[PDB]
Design a protein around this ligand. Sequence first.
Ligand SMILES: Cc1ncc(C[n+]2csc(CCOP(=O)(O)OP(=O)(O)O)c2C)c(N)n1
Ligand SMILES: Cc1ncc(C[n+]2csc(CCOP(=O)(O)OP(=O)(O)O)c2C)c(N)n1
Ligand SMILES: [Mg+2]
Ligand SMILES: [Mg+2]
Ligand SMILES: [Mg+2]
Ligand SMILES: [Mg+2]
Lengths: 207, 207
Amino acid sequence: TKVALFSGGDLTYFTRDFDYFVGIDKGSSFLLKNQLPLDLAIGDFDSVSAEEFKQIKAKAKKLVMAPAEKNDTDTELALKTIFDCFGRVEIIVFGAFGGRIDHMLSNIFLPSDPDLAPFMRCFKLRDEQNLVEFFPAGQHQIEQATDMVYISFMAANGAHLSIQDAKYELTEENYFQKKIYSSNEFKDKPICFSVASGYVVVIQTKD
Amino acid sequence: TKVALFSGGDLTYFTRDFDYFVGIDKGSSFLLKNQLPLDLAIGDFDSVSAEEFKQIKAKAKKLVMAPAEKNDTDTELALKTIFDCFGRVEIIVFGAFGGRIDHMLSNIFLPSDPDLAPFMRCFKLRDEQNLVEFFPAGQHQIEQATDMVYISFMAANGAHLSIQDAKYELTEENYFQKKIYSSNEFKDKPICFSVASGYVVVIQTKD
Ligand SMILES: Cc1ncc(C[n+]2csc(CCOP(=O)(O)OP(=O)(O)O)c2C)c(N)n1
Ligand SMILES: Cc1ncc(C[n+]2csc(CCOP(=O)(O)OP(=O)(O)O)c2C)c(N)n1
Ligand SMILES: [Mg+2]
Ligand SMILES: [Mg+2]
Ligand SMILES: [Mg+2]
Ligand SMILES: [Mg+2]
């Protein structure tokens, strides 16, 4: 019931404890190259040699060819596909960062897509020292994840945030403008945060 | 009249053609270690050894000690300081990315700070394969930068965007929701874009 997507980012970190393995473009080649299952290879594969795509084309339990010129990114397309086949499943996206900033932002703001927003609570961005979760507009609580030390909140579409029970709080009584409030920490208690509309992007990090 | 800031990110790329050289935390050590001028070392330096901070403490033409617990990031503080000393000067920030996602976002959305917004057109984020510019709300035009191939637009605080004269346009007649519209390209003509409010973040990239 646990799916794992190996994006085209830099997979210097990844886990193997997963039911289904999805590989976007280069991720497909990475998976194989690491003695790992390739249940699904998706994307336009414009980021892999014919030599590599030859091994993927004859090893992937399933392969999806996506148009070169489109609106959704291979990772976006991959997440949309899976949510259709499995429905509300738990996803972890590896290699969602690195290299290009435009692509990273695309992953950081995946929920911004109307079709993904509803499932924004089913997938996460993860790598060596970063963990990214997405919360719909409203009231929420969060407990610190293992390994991680710092935590930050950022509302896509500038809606005022509220943060309590954290080392640094953000009340309506001391609010100071900033897109992302980083370097915050827990303190033996769940952190409370909320947002009138949109959705919040929580980023737990370490090091 | 050209200032350059060497942040604590990964400086695998940088230029030397600058009047003033500013170094945030680790950047200060990097600058020296590269036979480069250190006109200003700023930050809390909690990211450098006493051994390194000993060389910085006695080489920096100027050094600023910032509190450990604060609201602004060393880079934010550094940019605010310079804009005070020089006023509207041209800045290029190196090592604004890498490692932590929370810090990257802080640099990606630097204009989100009320005190920086006014000077958002005076500084840029740059590295190996990425170039980041910031434009205030309103009408604007942009010509492709050298070396870069792709270009993307993203409005902080979700305001509808408009994009014309680019390979892919975003009109009010075909609009589709998404935080960042990436992988767009120029085509022998300036790209026109605008936003009712807030500010736009343009990211030219390559590779
Ligand atoms: C508003 C307008 N902006 C830009 C695009 C172009 N675009 C956005 S997603 C995408 C797909 C390409 O990205 P990806 O699948 O990650 O492959 P890559 O960019 O690495 O070649 C394209 C072409 C568009 N169609 N809509
Ligand atoms: C709303 C609330 N969120 C979080 C903070 C904590 N905070 C935001 S910027 C910052 C400075 C630390 O960052 P930086 O200067 O880059 O050093 P580093 O995080 O690498 O140790 C802190 C402590 C705050 N004061 N306001
Ligand atoms: Mg691709
Ligand atoms: Mg492509
Ligand atoms: Mg610091
Ligand atoms: Mg610090």
